[PDB]
Amino acid sequence: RIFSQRLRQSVQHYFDNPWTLTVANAERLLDMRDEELALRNEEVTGELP
């Protein structure tokens, strides 16, 4: 009967001393937004062997 009182009172009265934990939050790797793929179209022609 040790933690019941210990933890319940903390949740019940949290807003009298609100506190927050710290975490590692390394940056995301920025990349180019992919533009719509634009292929090369040229209607090539030539003499057939």
Binding site: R6, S10, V11, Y14, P18, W19, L21, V23, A24, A26
Partner: protein, 212 residues
């Protein structure tokens, strides 16, 4: 002799960094994920080369820490080379409730499987429902639309805690999940039966927690 690994690096550290598990783990760790006993591969790896990893990461001005419960995590210093961030108060409410749920022997028979509804029911049983509703919307007074909005915010934050490694969803059902020991960090303000103010001061001094 020259051109010899020992000139630049300890053999055990190089051996660790050359392992196939390292990139995954590194990536994750940097992202803030906690590592518990269930993910054997990772955990075991951590255990094997603990001191080398600690020494390594030290270069970055970050502590690789081991909680008593057996879970590893990253704590940045003030001079950290890697950014540091803080959790939201709703995340704390869900965190402390997940902690009480883990301890509860009354629900141990579930074999760790809990449902979002049970979590929500426990939370409203303990905290001030109508006063907590203030965070969802400044005009909330117990309306069902606002109650569903609260449930959806809980659903969202719980998903963030999953990315942090604090809870694992079932393989085929997303309405049910399992806890891990990493949740005990939410009890860092009460694990010792002493003056709350002094504890809080100690924690902020150690870089564990910030006020709001």
């Amino acid at each position: 002799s020259s051109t010899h690994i020992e000139q630049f690096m300890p053999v055990k550290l190089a051996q660790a960094l050359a392992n196939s598990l390292f990139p995954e783990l590194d990536s994750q760790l940097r992202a803030g994920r906690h590592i518990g006993i269930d993910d054997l591969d990772n955990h075991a790896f951590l255990m094997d080369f603990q001191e080398q990893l600690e020494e390594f990461y030290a270069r970055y001005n970050v502590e690789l820490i081991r909680a008593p419960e057996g879970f590893f995590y990253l704590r940045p210093r003030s001079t950290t080379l890697i950014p540091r961030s803080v959790l939201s108060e709703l995340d704390m409410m869900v965190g402390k409730i997940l902690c009480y749920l883990y301890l509860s022997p009354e629900r141990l028979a579930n074999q760790g499987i809990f449902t979002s509804q049970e979590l929500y029911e426990e939370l409203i049983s303990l905290a001030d429902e109508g006063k907590l509703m203030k965070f969802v919307n400044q005009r909330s007074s117990g309306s069902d639309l606002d109650k569903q909005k609260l449930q959806e915010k809980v659903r969202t934050t719980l998903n963030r805690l999953r990315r942090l490694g604090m809870v694992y969803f079932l393989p085929n059902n997303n309405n049910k999940f399992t806890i891990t020991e990493a949740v005990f960090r939410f009890g860092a303000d009460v694990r010792s039966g002493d003056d709350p103010r002094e504890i809080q001061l100690r924690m902020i001094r150690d870089g564990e927690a910030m006020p709001v």
